[PDB]
Amino acid sequence: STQYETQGYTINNAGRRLVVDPITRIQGHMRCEVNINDQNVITNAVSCGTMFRGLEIILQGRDPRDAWAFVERICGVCTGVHALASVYAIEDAIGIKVPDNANIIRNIMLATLWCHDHLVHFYQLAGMDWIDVLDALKADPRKTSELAQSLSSWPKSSPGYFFDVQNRLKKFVEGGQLGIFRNGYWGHPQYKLPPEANLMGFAHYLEALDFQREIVKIHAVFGGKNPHPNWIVGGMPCAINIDESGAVGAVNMERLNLVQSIITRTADFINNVMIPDALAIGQFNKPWSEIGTGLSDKCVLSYGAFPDIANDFGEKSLLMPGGAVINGDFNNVLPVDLVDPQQVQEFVDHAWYRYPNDQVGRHPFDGITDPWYNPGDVKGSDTNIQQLNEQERYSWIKAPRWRGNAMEVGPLARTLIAYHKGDAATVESVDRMMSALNLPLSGIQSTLGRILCRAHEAQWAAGKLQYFFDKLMTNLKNGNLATASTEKWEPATWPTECRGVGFTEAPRGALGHWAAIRDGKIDLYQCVVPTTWNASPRDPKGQIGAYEAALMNTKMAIPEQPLEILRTLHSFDPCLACSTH
Amino acid sequence: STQYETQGYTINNAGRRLVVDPITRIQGHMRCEVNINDQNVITNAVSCGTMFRGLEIILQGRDPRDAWAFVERICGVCTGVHALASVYAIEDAIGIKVPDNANIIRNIMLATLWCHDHLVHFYQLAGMDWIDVLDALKADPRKTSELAQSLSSWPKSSPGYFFDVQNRLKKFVEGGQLGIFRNGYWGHPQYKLPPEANLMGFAHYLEALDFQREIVKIHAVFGGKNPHPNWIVGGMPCAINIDESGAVGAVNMERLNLVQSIITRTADFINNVMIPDALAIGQFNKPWSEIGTGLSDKCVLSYGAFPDIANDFGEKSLLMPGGAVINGDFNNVLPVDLVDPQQVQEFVDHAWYRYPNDQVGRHPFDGITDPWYNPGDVKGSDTNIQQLNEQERYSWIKAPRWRGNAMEVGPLARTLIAYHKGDAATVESVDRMMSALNLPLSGIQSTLGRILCRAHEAQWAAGKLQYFFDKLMTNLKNGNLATASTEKWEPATWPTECRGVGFTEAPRGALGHWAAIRDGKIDLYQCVVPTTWNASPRDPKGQIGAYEAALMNTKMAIPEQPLEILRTLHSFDPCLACSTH
Amino acid sequence: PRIPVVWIHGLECTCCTESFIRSAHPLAKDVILSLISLDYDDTLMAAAGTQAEEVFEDIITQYNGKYILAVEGNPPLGEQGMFCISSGRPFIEKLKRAAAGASAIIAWGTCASWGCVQAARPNPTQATPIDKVITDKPIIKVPGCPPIPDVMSAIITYMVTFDRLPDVDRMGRPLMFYGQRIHDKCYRRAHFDAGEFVQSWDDDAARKGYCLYKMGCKGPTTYNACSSTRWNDGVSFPIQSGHGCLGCAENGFWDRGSFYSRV
Amino acid sequence: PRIPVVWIHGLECTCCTESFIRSAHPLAKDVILSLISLDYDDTLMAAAGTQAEEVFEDIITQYNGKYILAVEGNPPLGEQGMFCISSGRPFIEKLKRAAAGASAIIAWGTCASWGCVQAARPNPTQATPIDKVITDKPIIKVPGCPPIPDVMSAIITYMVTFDRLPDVDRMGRPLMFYGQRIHDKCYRRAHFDAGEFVQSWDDDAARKGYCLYKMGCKGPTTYNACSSTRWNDGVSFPIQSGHGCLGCAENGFWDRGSFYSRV
Ligand SMILES: CCCCCCCCCCCCO[C@@H]1O[C@H](CO)[C@@H](O[C@H]2O[C@H](CO)[C@@H](O)[C@H](O)[C@H]2O)[C@H](O)[C@H]1O
Ligand code: SF4
Ligand code: SF4
Ligand code: SF3
Ligand code: SF3
Ligand code: F3S
Ligand code: F3S
Ligand SMILES: [Cl-]
Ligand SMILES: [Cl-]
Ligand SMILES: [Cl-]
Ligand SMILES: [Cl-]
Ligand SMILES: [Mg+2]
Ligand SMILES: [Mg+2]
C-alpha cells in the first residue's frame, strides 16, 4: 500500500477496498473504488469511466457542416449541448456570424435543456438517495397534505391525492415485483425524511416523470425532435414566417404560441415543485452541507454561456458568467482563455491513451486520442478486474487541468463564480436560500449544496426562457426575421486552414469543442466535456479530480451499502458518455 | 287578458308582462315572455325560438351519402349527433348493415359528445346561475381548501391554489373590465352558496374550460376534427391497421393509445370535479327540488340510444333505454314507434309555418317546412316585437306531440324512463343520490333534478367510453378490423324509392331524422330534435310544452332580474339552432 | 387595459365559438382573462335580456371606434330579417349598430365569411355574408366550418401582439394560414403523385393511407392550414382520419357537387 | 403479475431511454407501474454495485425463459471488449447472459439495430449490432436515433395487449411503423413533385416550407413514421422544422455521405 498527500488530502490505499460497479442512476458506465479505514472513513477514492466510443476519431475527414450531428450523439441526456458547441466551433473557425434570431433560438434551446435535464436529475436520478420510497407507505395522507401546503402553493396537495399515490405504490409492491425499487437501500440510517416528506417527494417524482416530456416540445418546434434536435452552421434551420403566404410551412404565430405555453408551465413546475422540494431536502439533511466539499472550496471553473449579444462571447455578453478560482481564493476570479496553451490541458498518465510524453499535458488543439487499453497490475486480470490499479492507468476519461490545477465544474462551480463576480441575481438567490436553511454561505460547498445550486439554476433558466422568447418576439415585431447566414455555407468560401473553439455551459459544467479545418475537412476535433473534468483520474503530480476529492474523508454507516458514495457522486450528475466521448 | 286550464295549470295572461330577449348561456336565439301576478308568481310563460335556417329545405335533392355533413351543421354544440342520426336514417332506408367496429366507434363518438357537452353545460352555461362569481372575492382560501377536500379526492385543492385563483379574479375585475361577468345577477337572494363554495366552483369553472378541449381529441382521432367530425354511410372512414405495412396511414396502436389516455382523464375529471360539484349544488339549493317540475311528473319521452348489437335498434340492444310515460303513470312505460303516424306529430298552429290544415298534426314522413313569418299584433310591428301574441303564431319552433301529449325529453326524462323500466343500475344510482341529499324520489322531478341527472349521465357516459373501447380492442385482437360496408355504396344498388328513420339520444334528448329517397336523391328530410320538444309552442288544444310548464307557478324575488327563469331554462340545456334547424 | 371585443351571433350553429374554446395555446381561458376584454358574448355572458342589452349599449357607446367586432353567423334578408330576431328586432339591425362603432371586424367561419350551410341551395332565408352588408369597415375573413381552433387563437394573438391586422389575400383571408392549399401540404401527396388511391371505403389502399382524390377529396381547391397545423392540438385532420376534404373553407363548397364526386 | 423486462445498456448515448420516457400515451410512468415489470435498468434503478448485480442475477434466474430483454447500445469487439466494462468484465458477457434467458429481444434504436455513431468510419471500438452477436433469439429492431417516443410505447403496448411480437419486414423492423418511407408520407411532397426546393437556408422557399431534397434530405431512402406520427406528442419532425432527414433509422446512415449532399 502507499500513502501520499495532495490538495490537503491524505491518499491512503491500505485497508479494505470497496467497489461500486455498476454505478446506477447516472448516464453511461462508471466504476468507483474506495479504501476505507477501521473507522468506516474513506481514505482513497478512484473514479473510472468504463466506456469509450471515439467520436474525436470518427469526426476526422468529415465535412465541418455535418459535425454537429455526430457530436450531438455524444449524449442523449445533455442532448443538444454538443451540437451547440460544435456550430459555435465551426463558426469560430470559418468566421461566420449568425443572425440575432438564430442566437436567441440557440439560447432558448440551451435554457430548455437546463430546465429539462436539471428536473429529471433531481427526481429520477438523485431523488431516491434522499427519499425513502418504501417509507412513504407509512405516511399519513392528511399530514402529507398539510406538509406540502406549508411549503408551496402548488395545487396538487389534497389528502385524497396523497392517499391515491400511496395506494398506487402499495399495489405496485403487493405482488412482490418491486422493479426499480428492488434491493434498494431503504431503511438505511442516513434516510432522514419523515414518512410524510417521503410520500410528498415520491408523488413529486411521479409528477416530474410525467411533466418532463412537455418541456422538450420547445426543442421539437425549433429543432424538429427531442432527443437529438437539428441545427445548422450559420444559424438554425427553422425559418420564420409570421404574416406571409406559406407561414404554414414555417415557424409561425401558432408555433410560437405553443412555445410560450410550455415556458409558462415549465417555470410554474420548477418554482412550485422542485424548488420547495430541494429546500425540504436541505432542511432535513443539514449535516450534508459539510460532506462532499471536495474541490468546491479550492478550485472551480466556468467558461460562461448564453451570449446575449449575437456572436459576442465576451464578458459583457455572456448572461451566465465565466471565470476560474484556484487556491481557495474566491476574491480573485480569473479570466479563462480557451486558445491559451497554458490554460486547458489534458493528461493521460492515468488514462487508457497513448501520448508521446505522458508526463505532460496537451492543449486540445494539440490533442491526441489514441486509445490504449492497459490496466496493468490489477487484482484479477485485464478482462476480469477485481481492483483497478490507480498507481497506473485506470480510466477511459482523460485528466483535464486548468493552469495545472484540478477543478470542479457544474452548477455549484457556476454559482460560486457568479456569486463572487457580484452577479446581483445570483447573490440574492444564494443568500435567500442559505438564510432559509440557517446555514452559512460555506454550506453550499458540499454535496447538499450541489443539489441546491442545481435547483436554483433550473429556476434561473426558466426565467431566462421568457426573457429570450420576449427578445425573439421584439425582433419579429421590428420585421427582423432572419435565422441563417449562408454567405460562408459553401466550402470554397472557407479559409484553406483555420481553427476555432466553441464553448458553453452544459447542465453539468464547462464544455469546449476545439476544431481544426483544412482543405474543407475536419483535421482535428477535440472535446473536453464537464464530466471529463469532474470524473477525471489523477495527473503526474498525483492531483485528484473533483469526484475523488469529494468522496475523500466520507463516513459510511454500512460499508456494504454505498449510499453515502452514491449521494455524493449523484450530486455531480455524472454523464459518462459525455466524459469519454 | 284571458285564462284557460291545461295539464293542471291555469294559464293567465293578466298582470305584468316580462320579456327576456336575448336568453344568454344557451346555444342560439331564444325569447321568453312571462306574466306574473300580484305575488310575483308566473301565471303564463311563452317560449319563442327566434331563428330559422331551413336545413330540411336545403337537404332536398342532395345525395343521401352527403346528408350527414349538411345536417351535422344543425348544431356545433351537439356536434356529431345529427350526423349519427343521418347515417342511421339513410342506412335504414337503403338497407345497409355496418360492421361491428363501425358501430362501436359511432357509440364512442356519441359517448364522447355526452361527456363533453354535459361538462361544458354544467360549468360554462348553467354554472353562473348557481355560483356567485363576484362573491368568490370574499372567500377565505384556507376554508375553500377545507371545503374542497371534504367533498372530493381531486388533487387541486391547496389554499395557495385557491388564493391564486381568487387573486387572478381580483385583478381581472379591478380595472372595471368585467367581461362576461358585467351586469350579472350577483348578490341576488337566490344565490345561497357561501363564499368558499363560490370560489371552489369558480376554480372548477376554469379547470373545466381548460379540460373540455381534451375530451374531443377522441373525435379528432376517429372523425378528423372537432367541431364537426366526418362520417360515412356504411360505417366510418377511419380505416384500421394495427400490424401491417402502412399502419402510419390508419388508426394504429399509437392512435388507440391516445384515445385510451383521453378516456381515463375524462372519467377522472367528471367523477372527481363535476359529480361532487353537482351534489354540492343540490345540498345547498334543496328548495329547487320543488321548483320547475313542469311536465317531468306528467309526460316524459326517450327513444333510446347506444345499440350494443350492431344494426339492432331493439330493446335488447340499446344500452340507453327508450319509452314514454303519459298522464303521470310511471307504472306503465309505453313503447315508442317512430313509423307510426299516430305517435310523433308536429303542429304549427302557434308557429311560423304553413300547413294546409293547421289544426292537425303531421307525422314527419308527411312533414312540411314552409316558413311563414306571421306574428299578428305584437304591440309594435312585424320588425319590432314588443309582446309576442301567444294566442296566435309566436315561434320558429314546431310543436311536437306524442299520441297528442306534450312531453319532456332529456337527461331527467331518460333517467325516469330507465328507473321505471327497472334498470337496476339506474334504480341503485338514483336511490343512493336522493338518499345522500335526504330528499324523496319526487325531488328529482325538478330544476335541481335536471342538473343532477345531467351530471350522473356524464359519469355514465365516461364509463361507457371504456366499455366501448374495450369492445373495439377485443375485435382487433380477434383480427376483426372492418370499419365500412360498401356493398350498397353505389346508387345503382339502392331501391328506386325507400324511406328510413334514424334516431338516438342526443345530450338534450330524443332525436329523430326521417328521410325519403327517390331516384338516388333526398325527396324529403324531416328532423324533430330534442329542444323542438322541450321549447315547443302550444298546440290546437292549448297544451303547453316542457319549458312553458316548468316556468309556470314559479316565484320571482326581483322581477327585473330573471334569475329564476334562467335557472329553470338553463336546466334543460336549450339548443335553439337544434330546435329550429 | 385589454382591448375591448364584442362578439355577436347571427344565424349560426355555434361551431365557431366551440372551435375557439378548443384552443390549446393560448388557452381560451387565458385569451379571455389576459389578452382581450370579451365584453359581450351571448354564449358565455352572465347577463340576459335587459341586462345583456345594457351591456351591449354601454360597451359600444363607451368604446366607440375602439372595439373589435367578432361576428359568428350571418344575417338573413328574407322575411324583413325576422328569420333571426334579437331583442325583438332583426339581427341585421344589431349587426349594423355593432359594426358602426367597431375599428375592425373579424368574420369567423364560413358563415360570416361566405354564407355556409344556410346559404346553400335554395337559401331559404336569403342568408348573406357580412361583407355584403357591411361595406365601410375592415373585415378579416377566417373561413372554415369551423376554422381550426389554434388558427383562431393565433390570429387573435397576432393582432394583440403586433397591434395590426394580418395581411390578407384578395378575398380578405389571412395569408399566414390561408395562403396555400390543403393539397399543397398534404402528407398523402406521395400517393396522389403515384396514382395510389382509395377506391372504396376500407379497401387495402385505405388501410395504408392512400390518397382520397377518387373518394371526392376537395383538398386540391381548398385553402386552409389543416394539413400542416392540423386540428385539436395537432391530433388529426379530415384526410388523416380517412375522409376527403369537403372544401369547407371555400365559398360555396356545399353546392360544388357531391362530396364524393372528384374535383 | 406483470411481464418481466430486463433493460441493459452497452455503448450508447442514452437517447433511446430518454425517448422512451417522453411517451405521451401511455405515459412511461404508467408503462412502468401498470403494463410491465421493469426489473433491471441502470438508468433508473435504486440499487447500485453489488446490490444491482444481485437484482440482475435474481431476475434472470427466477424468470429464466420468461423475461423480455431490451437492449440499448451495442457491444464493442475491440480491446477484448473492454471498451465497455460492466462489473469489471466485458459488456458482451452481460449481453450474452441476459440474452440466453430471454424469450425475445427488443433492439432499441440504431445503436442496437445497426451500430449507429460509434460504428461510423473508422469504428474505433469495433462496435457491433446485437443481431451479429446474438444469433439464437428473436430480435425486433426498432431503429432511429432515437426512435419516436410514441412508437416505442405503441410497440410495447401492442406486445402486451396482443401477447405477440409485431410482424416485421425482412430486416426485423415492425411493419406498422417502418413499412413506408418518410418521403412516402411527407407533407412537402407537393413541392418535391412541383420542383419547388429550398436552395439555401432561410431563402424565400424555406420560409414557405418547400421541399428539402436539394438541402440533402434523406427521406427518400429512409423508413420510419416521423412524417405521419411525428415527434413529441405530434408537435414536429425534422423536416417540418426545416432540416432534411438525416436518414437516422437506416443502417450506415452516418457514412452515406454528407447530410447536405443530395440522395
Ligand atoms: C375574439 C377576438 C377577436 C379579435 C381581437 C383582436 C385585437 C385587435 C388589435 C388590432 C390592432 C390593429 O387595429 C387596426 O389598426 C389599423 C391601423 O393599423 C386601423 O386601420 C384604420 O386606420 C388606418 C390608418 O392607420 C387606415 O389605413 C385604415 O383604412 C383604417 O381602417 C384599424 O381600424 C384597426 O382595427
Ligand atoms: S388526400 Fe386530398 S389533399 Fe391529400 S394528396 Fe390526395 S387529393 Fe390531395
Ligand atoms: S422534404 Fe424530404 S421527405 Fe419531404 S418531400 Fe422533400 S425530399 Fe421527400
Ligand atoms: Fe361556424 S357557425 Fe357552424 S355552420 Fe359553417 S361556420 Fe357556421
Ligand atoms: Fe439511442 S443510444 Fe443514442 S446514439 Fe444513435 S440510437 Fe444510440
Ligand atoms: S373539410 Fe375543412 S377542416 Fe380542413 S381538411 Fe377540408 S378545409
Ligand atoms: S433523421 Fe430520423 S427522426 Fe425521422 S425524419 Fe429522418 S428518420
Ligand atoms: Cl349576438
Ligand atoms: Cl358558403
Ligand atoms: Cl446494463
Ligand atoms: Cl448504423
Ligand atoms: Mg476529449
Ligand atoms: Mg323539423
Side-chain angles (χ1 to χ4, degrees), chain A residues 24 27 66 76 185 210 255, chain D residues 13-14 29-30 47 51 235 258:
Chain A
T24 56
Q27 189 296 324
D66 293 309
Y185 304 103
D210 289 348
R255 299 281 81 182
Chain D
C13 86
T14 312
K29 174 191 72 182
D30 289 319
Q51 290 80 26
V235 164
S258 173

Side-chain angles (χ1 to χ4, degrees), chain A residues 275-286 289 430-440 443-444 446 448-449 452-453:
Chain A
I275 285 285
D277 283 353
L279 277 168
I281 292 175
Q283 291 289 9
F284 292 115
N285 296 271
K286 291 183 177 180
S289 74
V430 167
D431 284 353
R432 205 173 307 270
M433 180 175 79
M434 300 313 286
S435 292
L437 290 168
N438 297 315
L439 290 174
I444 209 171
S446 67
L448 177 60
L452 295 169
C453 288

Side-chain angles (χ1 to χ4, degrees), chain A residues 293-498:
Chain A
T293 299
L295 303 183
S296 71
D297 65 350
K298 299 165 190 71
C299 295
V300 294
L301 173 65
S302 174
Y303 298 162
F306 299 101
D308 210 25
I309 305 169
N311 312 296
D312 181 345
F313 292 91
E315 188 171 56
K316 295 174 163 175
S317 178
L318 297 174
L319 293 172
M320 175 54 65
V325 162
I326 62 165
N327 300 321
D329 190 358
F330 287 87
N331 185 58
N332 190 30
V333 178
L334 297 153
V336 174
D337 182 343
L338 299 179
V339 175
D340 180 349
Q342 297 303 307
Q343 287 189 43
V344 176
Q345 300 174 331
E346 295 183 291
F347 296 81
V348 300
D349 56 314
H350 290 280
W352 292 322
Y353 299 95
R354 299 190 191 270
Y355 273 7
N357 183 345
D358 68 14
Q359 297 296 290
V360 302
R362 298 180 84 94
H363 182 264
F365 283 141
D366 303 320
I368 304 171
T369 305
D370 185 7
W372 181 25
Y373 180 62
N374 180 10
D377 183 23
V378 293
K379 185 176 186 105
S381 71
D382 64 348
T383 60
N384 218 315
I385 302 167
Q386 291 167 226
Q387 289 185 23
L388 293 163
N389 189 347
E390 70 279 14
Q391 282 53 62
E392 307 187 287
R393 302 169 186 83
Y394 66 89
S395 187
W396 287 116
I397 308 175
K398 300 183 178 166
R401 300 290 183 266
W402 182 77
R403 298 191 181 279
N405 302 277
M407 315 297 284
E408 175 168 332
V409 301
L412 173 54
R414 283 184 292 253
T415 298
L416 288 161
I417 292 296
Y419 191 96
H420 290 282
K421 289 186 96 188
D423 179 70
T426 302
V427 171
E428 184 167 348
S429 178
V430 167
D431 284 353
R432 205 173 307 270
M433 180 175 79
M434 300 313 286
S435 292
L437 290 168
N438 297 315
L439 290 174
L441 177 62
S442 61
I444 209 171
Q445 289 158 302
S446 67
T447 289
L448 177 60
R450 290 191 192 84
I451 296 166
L452 295 169
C453 288
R454 187 172 292 101
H456 149 79
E457 280 199 339
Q459 172 181 75
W460 182 95
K464 288 296 177 261
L465 276 174
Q466 186 69 55
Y467 171 78
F468 295 133
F469 184 82
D470 289 346
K471 280 194 48 144
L472 179 61
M473 295 310 306
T474 296
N475 286 351
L476 301 184
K477 290 169 199 173
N478 288 142
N480 176 355
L481 270 46
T483 49
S485 168
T486 66
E487 51 277 7
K488 296 192 149 180
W489 174 252
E490 285 290 338
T493 68
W494 304 346
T496 298
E497 193 163 10
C498 55

Side-chain angles (χ1 to χ4, degrees), chain D:
Chain D
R2 289 163 286 112
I3 180 146
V5 175
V6 169
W7 187 316
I8 65 173
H9 300 255
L11 293 178
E12 43 86 40
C13 86
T14 312
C15 64
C16 295
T17 285
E18 287 280 357
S19 183
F20 167 62
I21 70 167
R22 300 300 186 275
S23 180
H25 40 255
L27 296 167
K29 174 191 72 182
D30 289 319
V31 171
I32 292 165
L33 289 178
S34 300
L35 266 190
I36 66 172
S37 189
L38 180 61
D39 288 336
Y40 185 90
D41 191 327
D42 282 350
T43 314
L44 296 174
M45 68 195 287
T50 63
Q51 290 80 26
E53 294 176 304
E54 286 166 359
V55 172
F56 183 79
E57 181 69 30
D58 285 351
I59 294 295
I60 69 174
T61 298
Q62 181 169 347
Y63 295 97
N64 177 63
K66 297 175 178 157
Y67 62 85
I68 299 298
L69 178 62
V71 182
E72 183 168 357
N74 51 38
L77 301 183
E79 292 286 20
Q80 304 176 265
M82 299 299 280
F83 287 121
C84 188
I85 305 167
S86 194
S87 299
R89 303 176 299 267
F91 167 71
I92 198 166
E93 296 189 1
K94 185 172 193 168
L95 170 62
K96 289 180 171 187
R97 184 156 186 21
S103 65
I105 301 177
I106 309 308
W108 291 131
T110 300
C111 281
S113 293
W114 302 120
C116 207
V117 75
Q118 54 266 32
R121 288 196 186 191
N123 191 355
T125 69
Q126 300 172 57
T128 304
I130 306 308
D131 73 339
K132 298 288 192 259
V133 173
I134 306 301
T135 63
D136 64 345
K137 294 289 169 160
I139 297 170
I140 307 299
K141 295 191 187 70
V142 185
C145 189
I148 298 161
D150 288 337
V151 165
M152 299 180 81
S153 61
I155 290 165
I156 297 169
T157 62
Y158 177 84
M159 290 186 296
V160 176
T161 294
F162 289 74
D163 197 30
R164 65 193 291 212
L165 299 178
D167 281 356
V168 294
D169 67 16
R170 70 178 140 231
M171 272 167 274
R173 303 179 294 200
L175 291 172
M176 54 179 73
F177 293 119
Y178 296 90
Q180 295 180 345
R181 300 171 193 91
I182 295 297
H183 178 80
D184 296 332
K185 280 300 204 297
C186 181
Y187 83 128
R188 302 186 179 201
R189 259 305 273 282
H191 301 304
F192 179 85
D193 183 62
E196 285 170 352
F197 300 113
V198 178
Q199 290 175 280
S200 62
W201 304 116
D202 202 24
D203 67 5
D204 289 349
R207 292 172 182 194
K208 293 181 281 192
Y210 281 10
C211 169
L212 300 171
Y213 169 75
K214 293 187 172 180
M215 302 310 298
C217 186
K218 299 309 180 323
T221 53
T222 302
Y223 287 84
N224 205 343
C226 311
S227 46
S228 296
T229 306
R230 292 180 321 282
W231 277 77
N232 304 106
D233 210 354
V235 164
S236 201
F237 78 115
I239 288 147
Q240 184 177 135
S241 296
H243 199 289
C245 175
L246 307 178
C248 82
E250 293 296 321
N251 184 24
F253 78 97
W254 296 103
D255 287 324
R256 289 256 164 50
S258 173
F259 296 126
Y260 300 110
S261 291
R262 305 176 187 189
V263 73

Side-chain angles (χ1 to χ4, degrees), chain C residues 11 34 53 69 75 85 108-109 116 127 136 144 159 163 170 172 179 190 227 232 240 243:
Chain C
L11 290 179
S34 296
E53 292 178 279
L69 178 62
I85 305 162
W108 293 129
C116 209
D136 65 338
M159 291 186 290
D163 193 29
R170 67 187 171 79
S227 50
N232 302 108
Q240 185 175 311
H243 198 287

Side-chain angles (χ1 to χ4, degrees), chain C residues 110 114-117 119 250-254:
Chain C
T110 302
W114 302 118
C116 209
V117 72
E250 291 296 318
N251 182 24
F253 77 98
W254 297 103

Side-chain angles (χ1 to χ4, degrees), chain B residues 19-29 31 50-55 57-58 62-63 65-66 68-70 73-77 116 120 124-125 128 168 172 177 179-186 205-206 209-210 212-214 216-217 220-228 230-233 237-241 245-250 255 258 352 371-373 382-386 396 481-484 486 489 560-562 566 577, chain C residues 1-4 9-15 18-19 21-24 27-30 32-34 37-55 58-59 62-63 79-80 82-91 93-94 116-125 145-146 149 187-188 200-202 206-209 215 231-233 235-238 240-244 246 248 253-255 258-260:
Chain B
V19 177
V20 191
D21 182 354
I23 303 288
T24 55
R25 284 179 296 122
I26 64 168
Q27 190 292 327
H29 298 282
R31 169 175 187 111
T50 42
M51 67 184 296
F52 174 75
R53 288 169 294 148
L55 276 291
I57 302 164
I58 291 161
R62 306 293 171 172
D63 190 301
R65 295 169 292 169
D66 291 306
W68 68 267
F70 286 81
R73 276 61 171 180
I74 288 170
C75 188
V77 179
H116 179 267
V120 172
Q124 277 62 62
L125 302 181
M128 288 191 296
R168 180 115 184 235
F172 179 79
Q177 293 188 288
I180 57 165
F181 309 130
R182 182 181 175 125
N183 207 20
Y185 304 100
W186 319 121
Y205 172 109
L206 294 176
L209 181 54
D210 289 350
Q212 55 72 38
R213 78 192 195 281
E214 293 295 289
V216 305
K217 289 177 170 179
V221 170
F222 296 118
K225 54 182 279 269
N226 175 292
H228 294 334
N230 301 299
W231 309 70
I232 56 168
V233 171
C238 54
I240 300 170
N241 179 352
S245 186
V248 293
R255 297 282 79 183
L258 170 58
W352 291 319
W372 184 22
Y373 180 61
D382 281 9
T383 57
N384 172 31
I385 305 169
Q386 292 289 314
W396 287 114
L481 276 45
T483 49
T486 61
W489 174 254
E560 304 81 6
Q561 293 195 53
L566 293 174
Chain C
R2 289 165 282 115
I3 183 157
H9 295 81
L11 290 179
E12 44 85 40
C13 86
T14 311
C15 63
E18 287 282 355
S19 184
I21 71 168
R22 305 295 187 280
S23 183
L27 296 166
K29 173 190 78 191
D30 288 318
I32 292 166
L33 291 178
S34 296
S37 188
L38 181 59
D39 286 331
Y40 185 88
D41 191 328
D42 282 351
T43 311
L44 293 176
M45 70 194 284
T50 65
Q51 290 77 35
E53 292 178 279
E54 289 166 347
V55 170
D58 289 351
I59 294 295
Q62 181 175 359
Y63 294 104
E79 291 289 22
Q80 295 190 293
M82 299 297 281
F83 286 122
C84 188
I85 305 162
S86 186
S87 301
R89 299 179 188 267
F91 167 75
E93 294 182 15
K94 183 169 184 169
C116 209
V117 72
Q118 55 268 32
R121 177 174 291 185
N123 195 350
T125 68
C145 189
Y187 83 127
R188 300 187 181 202
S200 59
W201 304 114
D202 202 27
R207 291 172 184 202
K208 296 177 281 192
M215 303 308 298
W231 276 80
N232 302 108
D233 208 357
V235 166
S236 202
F237 74 115
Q240 185 175 311
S241 296
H243 198 287
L246 306 180
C248 84
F253 77 98
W254 297 103
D255 291 321
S258 172
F259 296 125
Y260 303 108

Side-chain angles (χ1 to χ4, degrees), chain B residues 117-374:
Chain B
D117 201 328
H118 286 349
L119 181 64
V120 172
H121 179 261
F122 184 85
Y123 287 105
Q124 277 62 62
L125 302 181
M128 288 191 296
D129 298 343
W130 302 96
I131 296 152
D132 181 335
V133 171
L134 271 48
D135 186 63
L137 293 175
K138 283 176 162 36
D140 181 318
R142 288 184 293 181
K143 274 195 175 100
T144 305
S145 174
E146 289 162 1
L147 173 63
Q149 293 176 175
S150 77
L151 298 177
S152 178
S153 61
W154 185 236
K156 297 187 180 186
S157 66
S158 74
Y161 170 58
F162 287 119
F163 185 60
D164 289 342
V165 171
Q166 185 182 61
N167 277 329
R168 180 115 184 235
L169 181 62
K170 176 183 168 180
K171 287 305 217 273
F172 179 79
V173 167
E174 170 178 292
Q177 293 188 288
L178 266 65
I180 57 165
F181 309 130
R182 182 181 175 125
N183 207 20
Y185 304 100
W186 319 121
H188 191 284
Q190 285 286 292
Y191 285 116
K192 296 293 187 189
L193 276 54
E196 291 66 35
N198 288 315
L199 178 56
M200 173 185 79
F202 180 62
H204 296 170
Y205 172 109
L206 294 176
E207 291 186 49
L209 181 54
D210 289 350
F211 181 69
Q212 55 72 38
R213 78 192 195 281
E214 293 295 289
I215 301 171
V216 305
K217 289 177 170 179
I218 296 169
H219 280 192
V221 170
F222 296 118
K225 54 182 279 269
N226 175 292
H228 294 334
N230 301 299
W231 309 70
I232 56 168
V233 171
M236 293 296 276
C238 54
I240 300 170
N241 179 352
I242 308 303
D243 192 38
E244 300 164 69
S245 186
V248 293
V251 174
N252 62 44
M253 197 65 175
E254 179 271 339
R255 297 282 79 183
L256 294 165
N257 286 339
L258 170 58
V259 170
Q260 175 66 89
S261 73
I262 303 295
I263 293 172
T264 299
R265 293 170 66 209
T266 297
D268 189 31
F269 195 95
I270 288 166
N271 286 320
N272 295 295
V273 186
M274 182 194 192
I275 286 282
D277 283 351
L279 292 175
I281 292 178
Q283 289 280 26
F284 286 120
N285 298 270
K286 286 183 188 181
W288 283 75
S289 75
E290 303 200 23
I291 299 172
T293 299
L295 305 181
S296 70
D297 69 349
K298 298 170 188 67
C299 295
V300 293
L301 173 65
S302 175
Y303 299 161
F306 298 99
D308 206 29
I309 303 168
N311 311 299
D312 185 342
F313 292 91
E315 192 170 53
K316 291 179 177 178
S317 177
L318 298 172
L319 294 173
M320 178 56 61
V325 164
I326 59 169
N327 299 127
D329 183 8
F330 286 89
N331 289 335
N332 292 297
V333 176
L334 299 167
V336 174
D337 181 354
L338 298 180
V339 174
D340 179 351
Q342 298 309 317
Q343 287 187 46
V344 173
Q345 313 170 295
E346 293 183 292
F347 294 83
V348 299
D349 60 313
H350 291 278
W352 291 319
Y353 298 94
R354 297 189 192 275
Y355 281 1
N357 186 340
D358 69 12
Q359 295 296 293
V360 302
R362 289 177 162 264
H363 183 268
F365 282 139
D366 302 318
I368 303 168
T369 305
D370 184 10
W372 184 22
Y373 180 61
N374 178 11

